[PDB]
Amino acid sequence: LELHPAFDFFAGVADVELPGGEVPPAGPGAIQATWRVVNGNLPLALCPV
Amino acid sequence: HQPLIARDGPHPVEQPVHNYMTKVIDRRALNAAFSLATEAIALLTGEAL
Amino acid sequence: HGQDAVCEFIATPVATDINYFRRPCNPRGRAAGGVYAGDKEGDVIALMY
Amino acid sequence: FTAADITAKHRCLERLIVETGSAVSTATAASDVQFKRPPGCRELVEDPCGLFQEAYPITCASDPALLRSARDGEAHARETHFTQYLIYDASPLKGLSL
Amino acid sequence: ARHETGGGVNFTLTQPRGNVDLGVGYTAVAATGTVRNPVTDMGNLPQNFYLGRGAPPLLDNAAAVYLRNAVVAGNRLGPAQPLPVFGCAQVPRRAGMDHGQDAVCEFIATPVATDINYFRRPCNPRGRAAGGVYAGDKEGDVIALMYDHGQSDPARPFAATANPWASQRFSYGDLLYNGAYHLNGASPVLSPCFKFFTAADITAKHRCLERLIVETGSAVSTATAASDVQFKRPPGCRELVEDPC
Amino acid sequence: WGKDHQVLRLSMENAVGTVCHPSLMNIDAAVGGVNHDPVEAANPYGAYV
Amino acid sequence: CFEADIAIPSGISRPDAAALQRCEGRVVFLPTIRRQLALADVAHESFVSGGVSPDTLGLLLAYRRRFPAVITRVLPTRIVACPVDLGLTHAGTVNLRNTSPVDLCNGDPVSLVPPVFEGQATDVRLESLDLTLRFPVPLPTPLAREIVARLVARGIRDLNPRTPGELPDLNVLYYNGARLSLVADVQQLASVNTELRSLVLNMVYSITEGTTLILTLIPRLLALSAQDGYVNALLQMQSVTREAAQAPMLMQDGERRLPLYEALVAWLAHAGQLGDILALAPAVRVCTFDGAAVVQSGDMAPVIRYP
Amino acid sequence: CFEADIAIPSGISRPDAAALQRCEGRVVFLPTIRRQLALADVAHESFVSGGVSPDTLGLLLAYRRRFPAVITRVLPTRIVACPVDLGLTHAGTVNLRNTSPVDLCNGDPVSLVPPVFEGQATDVRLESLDLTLRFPVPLPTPLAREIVARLVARGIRDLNPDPDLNVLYYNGARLSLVADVQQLASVNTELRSLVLNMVYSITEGTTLILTLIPRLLALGYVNALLQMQSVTREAAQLIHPEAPMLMRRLPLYEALVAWLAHAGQLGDILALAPAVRVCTFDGAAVVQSGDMAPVIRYP
Amino acid sequence: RDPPGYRYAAAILPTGSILSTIEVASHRRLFDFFAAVRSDENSLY
Amino acid sequence: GYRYAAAILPTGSILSTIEVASHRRLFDFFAAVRSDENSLYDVEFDALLGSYCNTLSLVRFLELGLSVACVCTKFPELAYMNEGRVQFEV
Amino acid sequence: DGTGISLHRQLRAIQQLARNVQAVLGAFERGTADQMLHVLLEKAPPLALLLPMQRYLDNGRLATRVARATLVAELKRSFCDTSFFLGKAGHRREAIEAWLVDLTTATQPSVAVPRLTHADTRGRPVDGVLVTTAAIKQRLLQSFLKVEDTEADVPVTYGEMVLNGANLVTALVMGKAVRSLDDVGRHLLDMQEEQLETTRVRADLVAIGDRLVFLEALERRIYAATNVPYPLVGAMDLTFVLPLGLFNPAMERFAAHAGDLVPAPGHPEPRAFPPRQLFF
Amino acid sequence: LLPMQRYLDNGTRVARATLVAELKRSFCDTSFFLGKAGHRREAIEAWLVDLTTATQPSVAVPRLTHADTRGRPVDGVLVTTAAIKQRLLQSFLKVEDTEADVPVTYGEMVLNGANLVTALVMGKAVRSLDDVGRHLLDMQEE
């Protein structure tokens, strides 16, 4: 679930549009992506401090 | 035709084998060519005499 | 000097050790050779991926 | 990186080692900058890189300060420094001049 | 010797014969000088005691199947579709293997100041000269040669052991690595350490030294080269191994 | 070293033709390749707005 | 052998005559005992029922009421098959072909399973005689009993949806390593339903009166859990036994009937018979004369009688 | 027939030779069917499977796995056995040694474990080369299926204590199952793993079915016909057991295969299938202990 | 099958000397047709 | 008729002289040909060219250099002994 | 039948047995040598150990527990140091000269006079065998010279004697049916059918010291292509010990020079803490 | 080939893997062998004999008596390029039998006796038919 330097891949909710609600209606798991903004967004096993 | 060597004990007994394989001709055909200029044929024919 | 080579680049993490280099290796970081398999009909691409 | 270029190939070593003599290079020497191979018929290159799925490291180093020590072999070359690092050759080309 | 099967008849032929040494002294030595290649790639494999099951587990279940799957989770020796009551551990065969057969690495706890000068040397694992050769022919001697730590170590002569956590009876190699207790040994993986830590097999074992060295072109090994990760030996297909250790 | 006693240079301003071409963001098939065989729910604290 | 023949009925595609040569040692399901029979009831078009083709559970039920037969010798005129159900009286041990990804053992019982594998379809096609051929996959019987429980329970999940779409696939198998993925394409209901009912109805009779006293010792099971190795490994993590822990009910009439002994009888009567009433009967056993301990994929193993 | 030879190893004593003279007509198990075999494939020391001595489970795995052979004539330097499992049906008459029950004119006798009888009886040891030949017991199919379910039932009352299961009359005789003085304390530790197998396959399935069938029929031909032949049987068992016991689909159907996988193990383990038949000729139809019997090949 | 196999029936009518011998099955991916000697064949008679 | 060079010898009486193929057309192969057709002149053969056998070398045991260390000698009925074993002084 | 085809396929069974009978009768003579490679190697001690074993016995004798120790403590050193000597020192010469000559006479002559000797074409009797592999024999001969190579004598004594072997040529055919009259008579006409359509035997006889051996290699002749592992190859199994994560004792914590193994100036120098890593 | 031939003897997955790692390091070592350590006169000599002795001799043909130089037959070819053979001549192998060769002239087979009849009536045309065809009438009386 890590594939690309400029993006992230994480098992999120199925269908729920983001700017809404308090608790997601946890049904099926559909995975989705997002944009990594900066160089600092990469994980620290792939960059020593 | 293959020979064999009779072992003993825990290794299994052997029996002679035969092979009988069959192979196929492939056909190549290589080429040469040459020319005679137009002036030479009637010279060889006996026309232009 | 003669004909030109072409250098291509592949995004790799900075803390992937030099000990993996100075040694004949894949550029991908994992072995991928079909000769490494053992004829199981699934030791193709599921070796690579 | 084409798994289909792995998937299309078989594995019995009775037949495998003889195409290492005569295989098709994807490169052609007949152009100024090297090209993807045209249908200009064949090459009959040797190319061990496909059958082993390998590549070779050459004499390279992060600084010239390591590359001066890289001369006269791997006897006394500074393999690393503070952050600076050298890769000595490992190739069929080892031992040779060019 | 005939035997009729499916198809047709099947003749089997055998000729009984024997031999003898017919030499009062030694005859026919055999040297060993050239190597083709190592069979194994010399290591880097964890040992997994969850392959075995003889050990009594934790009593709290919340620690039981938390610590069980914390280790097993992805090991090269990691029992998936787990241990049947009847069956095998089903070692995960991977798709491709490159360098050869795998060696297995096993572990024994040591104190940090058991000085390194005892190493750099042909020294032994269990901190004590443990062979049945070294004793002084008393025939109750080799339990005392292996355990009587009021005495010294014949290997390291100024002391009794090199590791108290290896040497003695119930010294934790004695519980883990002695096949008489066998918390392990339900596992098909060959333990490298069973040659040591076994008071039963080195219970005098043989002692006539002259006959002893001719058996070192003999004594079928603990190992088999026929698996991906090396196994303890199945009783069929002997191998005439050399094995000095 | 090139085809001589030459020494060359591969300073990482070399990477401008490889990665900066606008295909680095082009990850539509990757999410299209992973979203089948769907994931279980993975307690989304920080995946949900 | 009590010889039974199947002739080559009408015409030959000339490479496909060689396709019948490399099927020596395979299995034909012919639903009879004949001295001669046409090749029409042989193929999978005969396995297809009225209008619809069976699923891999229906093919179990289709391989129920037919008769397996061993290819013995291949002529261009006939194919001599030996009737497994009767004519297994072979001290010559008539030989079979292993068409399976598993290297077996010596001494395995071998039962037949329809082709359900992801890459060993065993599909050979005849176009002069328009027929489709699915050869069964001979497998070892505990590995065979590990398969049929998966495919029915996968069809048990074909009755009820409820759960989220990430289900455990029942599609990863384990033999010493060797990750196997099978095909999940279609689940016909009646092949699931009749297989489900005998799984219900046999488990009814396998409980008796003296069976109930055993149910008291369910908390006694976990008392052995934290104090040994064997029990803790026997107790599965994905089990209801670890879930149900979170009593004589006297009714004692006569008390000379041996109530605990009578419990293990009828439990073994129906819950003891669960592999063979769902799947095919094993009658093939691995027996090599040369001392070979395993039999390779594609080999010709000698075959002996009922296990 | 196809007689197979087992090689006698090197120097044995005359009582070790006489130990080979008290076994002419026993039952022998062997892994492979090589025409020349050795004694190393025969002994009880050749039954090690996990580094320890096998139990009655660990024997009955192999006792259903490897192959029976019956020694017709004993020999120096060889052992001639005409094996049972080779040959066509009802041919190649062979001869056995009876143990304490009858072995009537029929019955189809079955090889099974020694410690269901006297454990150090028929564990005949060679003294010189120091190996052990634990010969199986040939019991006929009714009583062989009878005694196997009794001691594991006796293992329950020996498991967690607070009638007497051990009388078990034959047609004429009173068969003393209990060999008390030193055996029964070794019984409940040598069937030790086996009792757990008969239990755990019951505790799993019954506690699985009572959360299967209530989860079924509403999640219809199998629905109404579930309790059709189980009217006042399964609902009565739902009335009796579900009250005095305790009460999840995705681990449940995962446990469905696993129990039934263990069930398919036990059917191959238990029930002791017939392998050879007694159907003699011109006998008294009734065999006694220590007397031979003509025994024919296939059930 | 047999138009390769008649060549093995023609190999039963032999004239041709094979000079050096190694294992045939290592070159299985070389020939056009392979047959295997296993002590007997019911077809060759 | 199918193999035309075989019909260069007719070896029998073309005798009926009735309208062929207006009858039952029962022939497995027949060709109603005018004065000529190109397939009449086609010549083809698939030929057999090679068969080779290797020598099976029957190599005796009293040839090789390791015959020196052994003195093999005939003794039947060694299967009948439990001991025929050798005793020597020094 | 009266067809010659019936007689012709009767031929092609005879030319099936006539290749098979030589195959099994060959397999014993092939099998005869393979036993000798087992029964020699079963009684063969490894010669890195017997070169001190004899010179232990080159005394009176001692069992006084002191010589037993000093036997072992030298025996382990000769194996730890010189075991694989050829290849360990193949760059040298005039030690491999000395390496063979003790290996030529580390053993002792048996209680044996053959009465039928293998000559050397002059008169010289041969007193050793020295079986080696094919690969070793190549680089050994061309660098470590070399002899007249012809064995004048190797008698066909009562050792194999195929006149007793001719029974199963006829009796196995007699065990079945009337093939007994055929299977011995066919072998007469099979000599030109299957084949084609006290004497000298070639060998290699190197003389070293004042001795002579039949230095001959197998597997190019009588082990090839039979799927048999060549018995002069095998396995040395050596267990290895690596101390992991231990700690430097109190004396050896030095650096052997001032400036060496020094980090960049804003870095902790990680060599000062107890090591857990290990490299090999 | 030179390691690959060694595994074709003695008759397997571990044998498969132990080949390939051994092979790829041997390829990295023992290739471009004349330019690498060509100063070693000794190294080239044993490298030449593995060029000489690695391949498998097929079934010998009696007909073409391609022997030369007063009666020792010829068993190899070794076609190289120009400068290598000169350099092989100059220092490493200045080993000359002669410069003199006795080759042969062509062979042939023409469809004459019954090969015609077996081609234009039958399909199969046996090379050297009549020597086989007589001996097919000879073996059945032996």
**K131-132 and K216-217: which strand pairing?**
parallel
Q: d(Cα B26, Cα D27) in Å, to the nearest integer? A: 30
Let me know: does L62 contact L56? Beta carbons within 8 Å: no
In sign, the C-alpha dihedral spanning H125, H126, H128, H129 is negative
- Token pair, residue G17, equals 């005559």
Let me know: does H278 contact H105? Beta carbons within 8 Å: yes
Contacts 24+ apart (CB under 8 A), K35-38: K35/B8, K35/E17, K35/E19, K36/J66, K36/J69, K36/J70, K37/J66, K37/K131, K37/K231, K37/K232, K38/E240, K38/K231
Half-sphere exposure in the Cβ direction for E105 (13 Å, CA):
11
- How many CB atoms are located within 10 Å of the residue H220 CB? 8
- Residue of chain H with shortest Cα separation from B8: H36
Let me know: does H260 contact H240? Beta carbons within 8 Å: no
Question: What SS3 class is residue H134?
Answer: strand
Of residues C45, D49, L19, the one with CA closest to residue G118: C45
Q: How many helices (H) and strands (E) does chain D have?
A: 4, 4
Enumerate the H helices of chain H as residue ranges. 14-19, 56-63, 141-157, 180-190, 192-209, 221-224, 234-239, 249-269
- Token pair, residue L20, equals 């390939």
Let me know: does G278 contact G198? Beta carbons within 8 Å: yes
- b/e per residue, K270-279, with b = 16+ CB within 10 A? eeeeeeeeee
Of residues A23, A3, G96, the one with CA closest to residue A33: A3
- Token pair, residue A6, equals 């400029």
Chain C residue numbers with beta carbons less than 8 Å from the beta carbon of E226 are: none
Which neighbouring-strand residues pair with E30? K46
Q: d(Cα E79, Cα E72) in Å, to the nearest integer? A: 7
- Residue of chain D with shortest Cα separation from I28: D14
**K151-154 and K199-201: which strand pairing?**
antiparallel
- Token pair, residue H46, equals 């050749």
- Residue of chain E with shortest Cα separation from K38: E240
Q: d(Cα I25, Cα I23) in Å, to the nearest integer? A: 6
Which neighbouring-strand residues pair with D80? D85
Amino acid identity at H20 = L
Chain I residue numbers with beta carbons less than 8 Å from the beta carbon of K26 are: none
- Taking only residues 5 to 44 of chain I, the set having a beta carbon closer than 8 angstroms to any beta carbon of chain G reads 42
Q: Which helix (H) or strand (E) holds L130?
A: helix L129-135
Let me know: does C20 contact C29? Beta carbons within 8 Å: yes
Which neighbouring-strand residues pair with H36? H5
Distance from CA of H77 to the nearest CA of G (A): 21
Q: d(Cα I30, Cα I32) in Å, to the nearest integer? A: 7
Angle CA(A27)–CA(A31)–CA(A34) in degrees, nearest 5?
125
Neighbouring chains of A at 3+ CB pairs within 8 Å? C, F, G
Best mutation target among E21, E32, E216, E221 (most K Cβ atoms within 10 Å) is E32
- b/e per residue, H62-87, with b = 16+ CB within 10 A? ebbbbbbbbbbebeeebbebbbbbbb
- How many CB atoms are located within 10 Å of the residue H188 CB? 15
Best mutation target among G240, G242, G287, G294 (most H Cβ atoms within 10 Å) is G240
What are the C-alpha distances in Å from D32 to residues D47, F14, K11, K268, L115? 21, 21, 70, 52, 58
Q: d(Cα H34, Cα G288) in Å, to the nearest integer? A: 9
Q: Is I14 exposed, middle or buried (0-12, 13-18, 19+ CB in 10 A)?
A: middle
Which residue precedes each gap in chain J (C to N above 2.5 Å)?
none
Q: Which helix (H) or strand (E) holds L42?
A: helix L41-53
Question: Going by C-beta distance under 8 Å and a sequence separation of 6 or more, which residues neighbour residue D70?
Answer: D59, D61, D77, D86, D88
DSSP 8-state assignment for residue D35: E
Q: d(Cα K55, Cα K106) in Å, to the nearest integer? A: 10
Torsion angles phi and psi, residue E209, rounded to 5: -70, -30
Q: d(Cα C35, Cα E97) in Å, to the nearest integer? A: 10
Distance from CA of I30 to the nearest CA of B (A): 10
Q: d(Cα K208, Cα K146) in Å, to the nearest integer? A: 9
What are the C-alpha distances in Å from L21 to residues E37, F37, H165? 10, 37, 66
Q: d(Cα E37, Cα L19) in Å, to the nearest integer? A: 10
Across the interface, whether the CB atoms of K225 and I21 are under 8 A apart is answered yes
Q: d(Cα K232, Cα K129) in Å, to the nearest integer? A: 14
- How many CB atoms are located within 10 Å of the residue E23 CB? 16
What are the C-alpha distances in Å from G184 to residues E105, G56, G101, G114, K175? 41, 9, 19, 13, 58
What are the C-alpha distances in Å from G276 to residues D18, G61, G114, G202, K22? 52, 12, 15, 12, 51
Let me know: does I42 contact B23? Beta carbons within 8 Å: no
- Token pair, residue L3, equals 């390691």
Read out DSSP for G174-195? -SSS--B-B------HHHHHHH
Method: cryo-EM
Distance from CA of E213 to the nearest CA of J (A): 22
Task: Identify which of G288, G289, G291 has the shortest CB distance to residue B11.
Answer: G291
Q: d(Cα G97, Cα G24) in Å, to the nearest integer? A: 7
Q: How many residues does chain E have?
A: 245
- Token pair, residue G158, equals 């074909």
Half-sphere exposure in the Cβ direction for C47 (13 Å, CA):
22
**H110-112 and K205-206: which strand pairing?**
unpaired
- How many CB atoms are located within 10 Å of the residue L118 CB? 19
Resolution (A): 4.5
What are the C-alpha distances in Å from J45 to residues E128, J17, L111? 84, 34, 12
Best mutation target among K41, K199, K214, K223 (most J Cβ atoms within 10 Å) is K214
Question: What SS3 class is residue E125?
Answer: coil
Asked whether at least 3 C-beta pairs link D and I within 8 Å, the reply is: yes
Which residue precedes each gap in chain I (C to N above 2.5 Å)?
none
Across the interface, whether the CB atoms of I1 and G73 are under 8 A apart is answered no
Question: Going by C-beta distance under 8 Å and a sequence separation of 6 or more, which residues neighbour residue E232?
Answer: E188, E189, E190, E191, E222, E223, E224, H51
- Token pair, residue D42, equals 């064949």
Chain K residue numbers with beta carbons less than 8 Å from the beta carbon of L131 are: none
What distance separates the 2 farthest-apart alpha carbons in chain C? Answer: 48
Read out DSSP for I8-24? HHHHTS--EE------S
Residue with token string 């086609």: J42
Which neighbouring-strand residues pair with G69? G28, G83
CA G81 to chain CA mean position, Å? 22
Enumerate the H helices of chain D as residue ranges. 4-7, 13-16, 49-52, 64-67
Best mutation target among G174, G175, G242 (most E Cβ atoms within 10 Å) is G174
**H36-38 and H67-74: which strand pairing?**
unpaired
Residue with token string 């029992």: E79
Question: Going by C-beta distance under 8 Å and a sequence separation of 6 or more, which residues neighbour residue G174?
Answer: E80, E81, E90, G180
In sign, the C-alpha dihedral spanning H95, H96, H100, H105 is negative
Question: What SS3 class is residue J38?
Answer: helix
Across the interface, whether the CB atoms of E186 and H269 are under 8 A apart is answered no
Asked whether at least 3 C-beta pairs link K and E within 8 Å, the reply is: yes
Q: d(Cα L10, Cα L65) in Å, to the nearest integer? A: 35
Chain I residue numbers with beta carbons less than 8 Å from the beta carbon of D9 are: none
Question: What SS3 class is residue I25?
Answer: helix
Let me know: does C26 contact D94? Beta carbons within 8 Å: no
CB of D14 within 8 Å of a chain C CB? The answer is no
In sign, the C-alpha dihedral spanning H47, H49, H53, H57 is negative
Question: Going by C-beta distance under 8 Å and a sequence separation of 6 or more, which residues neighbour residue C33?
Answer: D6, D52, D53, E96
Beta strands in chain E (DSSP E): 2-4, 9-11, 223-224, 231-232
In sign, the C-alpha dihedral spanning G36, G38, G44, G50 is negative
Q: d(Cα K37, Cα K32) in Å, to the nearest integer? A: 9
Question: Going by C-beta distance under 8 Å and a sequence separation of 6 or more, which residues neighbour residue D8?
Answer: none
- How many CB atoms are located within 10 Å of the residue E91 CB? 24
- Taking only residues 16 to 35 of chain F, the set having a beta carbon closer than 8 angstroms to any beta carbon of chain G reads none
Of residues G279, I34, K248, K195, the one with CA closest to residue E113: K248
Angle CA(K46)–CA(K48)–CA(K50) in degrees, nearest 5?
75
Enumerate the H helices of chain G as residue ranges. 16-19, 44-47, 58-64, 141-156, 189-205, 218-221, 230-234, 259-270
Chain B residue numbers with beta carbons less than 8 Å from the beta carbon of G291 are: 10-13
- Token pair, residue H106, equals 């029929």
Torsion angles phi and psi, residue F15, rounded to 5: -75, 0
Of residues E192, E201, E227, the one with CA closest to residue E88: E227
Torsion angles phi and psi, residue D38, rounded to 5: -70, 175
Amino acid identity at H205 = G
DSSP 8-state assignment for residue L90: I
- How many CB atoms are located within 10 Å of the residue E93 CB? 18
Read out DSSP for C1-49? --SBP--------TTS-GGGSSS---SSSS---GGGS-S-SSSSSTTT-
Chain C residue numbers with beta carbons less than 8 Å from the beta carbon of E96 are: 31, 33, 36-38, 43, 47
Let me know: does G17 contact G76? Beta carbons within 8 Å: yes
- Token pair, residue E153, equals 């170590």
Question: Going by C-beta distance under 8 Å and a sequence separation of 6 or more, which residues neighbour residue K115?
Answer: none
Q: What is the 3-state secondary structure (H, E, C) of H145-196?
A: HHHHHHHHHHHHHCCCCCCCCCCCECCCCECCCCCHHHHHHHHHHHCHHHHH
Of residues G267, G9, G277, the one with CA closest to residue G130: G9
Distance from CA of B12 to the nearest CA of K (A): 12
The region that residue H236 occupies, defined by phi over 0 for left and psi between -120 and 50 for alpha, beta otherwise, is: alpha
Q: d(Cα J50, Cα L83) in Å, to the nearest integer? A: 40
Q: d(Cα J44, Cα J15) in Å, to the nearest integer? A: 31
Q: Is H17 exposed, middle or buried (0-12, 13-18, 19+ CB in 10 A)?
A: middle
What are the C-alpha distances in Å from L13 to residues E228, G102, L3, L20? 8, 15, 17, 11
Amino acid identity at I8 = Y
Chain H residue numbers with beta carbons less than 8 Å from the beta carbon of B8 are: 36
Chain A residue numbers with beta carbons less than 8 Å from the beta carbon of G166 are: 28-29
Let me know: does G106 contact G290? Beta carbons within 8 Å: no
Q: d(Cα K274, Cα K252) in Å, to the nearest integer? A: 14
Across the interface, whether the CB atoms of B8 and H35 are under 8 A apart is answered no
